[PDB]
Amino acid sequence: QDSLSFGFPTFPSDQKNLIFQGDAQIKNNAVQLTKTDSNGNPVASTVGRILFSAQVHLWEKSSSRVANFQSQFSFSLKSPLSNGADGIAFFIAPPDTTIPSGSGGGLLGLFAPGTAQNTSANQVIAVEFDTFYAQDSNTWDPNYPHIGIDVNSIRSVKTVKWDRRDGQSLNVLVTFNPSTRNLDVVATYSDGTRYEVSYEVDVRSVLPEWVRVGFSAASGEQYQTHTLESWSFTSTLLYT
Amino acid sequence: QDSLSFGFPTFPSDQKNLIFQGDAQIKNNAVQLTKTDSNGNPVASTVGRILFSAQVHLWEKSSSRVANFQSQFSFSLKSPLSNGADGIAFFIAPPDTTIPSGSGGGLLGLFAPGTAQNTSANQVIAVEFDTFYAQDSNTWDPNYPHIGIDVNSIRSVKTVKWDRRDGQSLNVLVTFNPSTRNLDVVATYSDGTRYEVSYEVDVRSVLPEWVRVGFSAASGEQYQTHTLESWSFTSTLLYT
Numbered sequence: 001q002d003s004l005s006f007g008f009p010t011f012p013s014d015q016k017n018l019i020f021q022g023d024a025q026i027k028n029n030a031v032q033l034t035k036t037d038s039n040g041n042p043v044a045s046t047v048g049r050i051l052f053s054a055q056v057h058l059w060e061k062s063s064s065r066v067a068n069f070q071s072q073f074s075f076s077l078k079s080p081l082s083n084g085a086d087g088i089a090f091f092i093a094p095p096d097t098t099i100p101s102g103s104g105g106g107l108l109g110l111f112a113p114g115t116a117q118n119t120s121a122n123q124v125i126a127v128e129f130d131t132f133y134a135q136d137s138n139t140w141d142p143n144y145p146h147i148g149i150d151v152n153s154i155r156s157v158k159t160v161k162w163d164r165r166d167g168q169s170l171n172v173l174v175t176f177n178p179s180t181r182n183l184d185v186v187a188t189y190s191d192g193t194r195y196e197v198s199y200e201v202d203v204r205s206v207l208p209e210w211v212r213v214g215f216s217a218a219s220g221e222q223y224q225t226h227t228l229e230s231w232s233f234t235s236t237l238l239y240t
Numbered sequence: 241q242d243s244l245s246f247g248f249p250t251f252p253s254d255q256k257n258l259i260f261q262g263d264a265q266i267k268n269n270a271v272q273l274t275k276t277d278s279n280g281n282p283v284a285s286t287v288g289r290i291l292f293s294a295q296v297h298l299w300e301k302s303s304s305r306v307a308n309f310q311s312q313f314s315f316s317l318k319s320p321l322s323n324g325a326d327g328i329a330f331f332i333a334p335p336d337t338t339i340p341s342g343s344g345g346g347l348l349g350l351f352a353p354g355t356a357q358n359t360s361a362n363q364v365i366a367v368e369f370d371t372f373y374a375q376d377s378n379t380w381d382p383n384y385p386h387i388g389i390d391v392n393s394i395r396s397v398k399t400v401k402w403d404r405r406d407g408q409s410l411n412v413l414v415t416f417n418p419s420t421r422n423l424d425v426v427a428t429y430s431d432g433t434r435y436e437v438s439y440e441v442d443v444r445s446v447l448p449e450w451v452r453v454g455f456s457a458a459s460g461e462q463y464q465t466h467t468l469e470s471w472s473f474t475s476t477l478l479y480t
């Protein structure tokens with residue numbers, strides 16, 4: 001299970017409970033979601049994701065309970081380009097989730113091109129930190145970098161303007177309260193700059209009872225490193 | 241991960257993070273470690289174990305840290321006989337552990353007949369609740385029911401006399417403090433009857449850095465059900 005929690009203050013190379021997909025790998029005590037060359041420089045056309053191995057009991061039909069969960073994490077992005085792409089996302093999906101074919105670039109390793117905006121063809125809740133918004137390729141995006149809440153589609157149900165800061169760690173707290181059904185996101189930079197966004201969603205109508213949680217990132221023609229520095233997660237089933 | 245915790249207040253049939261070995265299975269929101277017939281009565285010659293799927297980081301060579309952990313669980317034993325056997329044990333072992341051949345009866349599903357008392361051939365720390373001690377077959381046991389701490393051998397390094405109460409739940413708290421290296425066990429029945437046993441052990445010289453935790457039980461010619469009712473576990477790597 002009814003309750004599960006784990007904490008990664010750092011990510012040593014000796015990992016046993018992380019499922020690595022695509023190009024994701026551990027380097028220098030952090031998870032590099034997207035591929036980097038020998039000099040640690042980012043490269044184009046790469047997708048990578050990690051998931052915690054144990055499944056999370058998100059809700060329970062029989063007992064009418066839904067989990068209260070919190071995910072705290074920090075990441076940094078770096079690129080020599082003026083338009084580093086494409087972004088990193090914290091996501092919740094069915095346990096057998098894998099990288100969809102062609103999900104690179106602006107699809108952040110979460111959606112397949114053909115059904116990216118078909119809400120009835122997907123089962124995913126994600127919080128994206130999207131740094132690439134060219135209106136000719138990322139037609140679904142607002143015209144500025146943003147934090148978005150994605151529910152079964154790459155076209156966010158809600159976005160707020162966000163500032164990308166090269167090489168600076170962003171600390172994020174994502175919380176879900178089953179009583180109000182509010183998914184809240186609060187992100188801060190070390191100088192105190194803060195971003196907040198909330199959305200009401202009944203997770204029971206979007207995801208199965210058991211899910212896996214993790215992160216995904218991708219780079220298309222433009223690129224940047226997507227470094228996950230720390231992560232703690234806790235979930236507990238509660239009556240509603 | 242550095243920290244991990246999980247809680248099972250009960251055991252619904254829909255499990256995803258438990259590894260079942262032998263005859264162990266879920267029945268009536270509890271784990272029945274040993275086989276039972278259609279009427280739910282215990283049968284002879286059965287072994288069953290469960291392990292939590294995520295691996296626990298017990299100690300870290302690079303940082304010189306060792307985990308502080310706590311395991312709380314409750315179980316009950318019942319048998320038509322008056323000489324129910326053989327017992328249940330909470331154990332910690334390498335992640336790939338499996339039921340050894342011939343480990344039924346008094347070996348509790350934890351040791352192989354030929355190496356049961358050879359400390360150099362095993363890697364396991366267990367806390368046993370042993371109800372059968374006939375000296376012809378269980379030659380290593382004290383002559384009475386007991387709780388024992390087992391370190392690489394079925395012959396406990398430390399035991400305390402214990403009372404088996406048919407059908408009554410025993411609440412147990414097992415704690416390991418890396419500062420003192422004390423593995424402490426406290427068991428209590430609902431009326432307040434308490435049993436305590438402890439032993440100093442350097443887990444680093446007995447087990448690998450990553451392990452799995454779980455329970456094991458067995459019945460040889462004599463039998464009883466070994467019902468695990470609830471289980472909570474928490475571990476945190478600490479500097480000492």
Ligand SMILES: CC(=O)N[C@H]1[C@H](O[C@@H]2[C@@H](OC[C@H]3O[C@H](O)[C@@H](O)[C@@H](O[C@H]4O[C@H](CO)[C@@H](O)[C@H](O)[C@@H]4O[C@@H]4O[C@H](CO)[C@@H](O)[C@H](O)[C@H]4NC(C)=O)[C@@H]3O)O[C@H](CO)[C@@H](O)[C@@H]2O)O[C@H](CO)[C@@H](O)[C@@H]1O
Nearest residue numbers: 045081083085102104105106107134136137219220221222
């Ligand atoms: C290779 C790969 O993995 N592909 C993914 C794919 O990724 C998409 C891909 O888009 C390619 C380009 O699409 C359009 O042409 C543009 O949006 C272009 O962006 C450049 O041009 C626009 C203007 O037209 C600018 O606004 C934008 O900033 C960018 O500017 C260019 O920047 C570079 C570097 O600074 C500079 O050298 C150029 O001079 C400059 N060009 C111009 C004209 O100014 C896109 O690059 O890559 C995007 C970025 O990574 C992704 O967001 C896209 O999704 O995505 C599909 C899924 O949809 C996936 O299947 C495929 O594998």
Ligand SMILES: CC(=O)N[C@H]1[C@H](O[C@H]2[C@@H](O)[C@H](O)[C@@H](CO)O[C@@H]2O)O[C@H](CO)[C@@H](O)[C@@H]1O
Nearest residue numbers: 285325342344345346347377459460461462
């Ligand atoms: C019938 C059976 O399962 N035999 C196992 C045997 O059991 C012994 C003893 O260990 C038990 O304590 C008592 C009471 O249940 O029954 C028998 O006498 O133990 C062997 C291990 O020493 C197992 O290999 C046998 O499978």
Ligand SMILES: [Ca+2]
Nearest residue numbers: 106130132138
């Ligand atoms: Ca985008």
Ligand SMILES: [Ca+2]
Nearest residue numbers: 346370372378
């Ligand atoms: Ca015995």
Ligand SMILES: [Mn+2]
Nearest residue numbers: 130141148156
């Ligand atoms: Mn977006």
Ligand SMILES: [Mn+2]
Nearest residue numbers: 370381388396
């Ligand atoms: Mn014994």
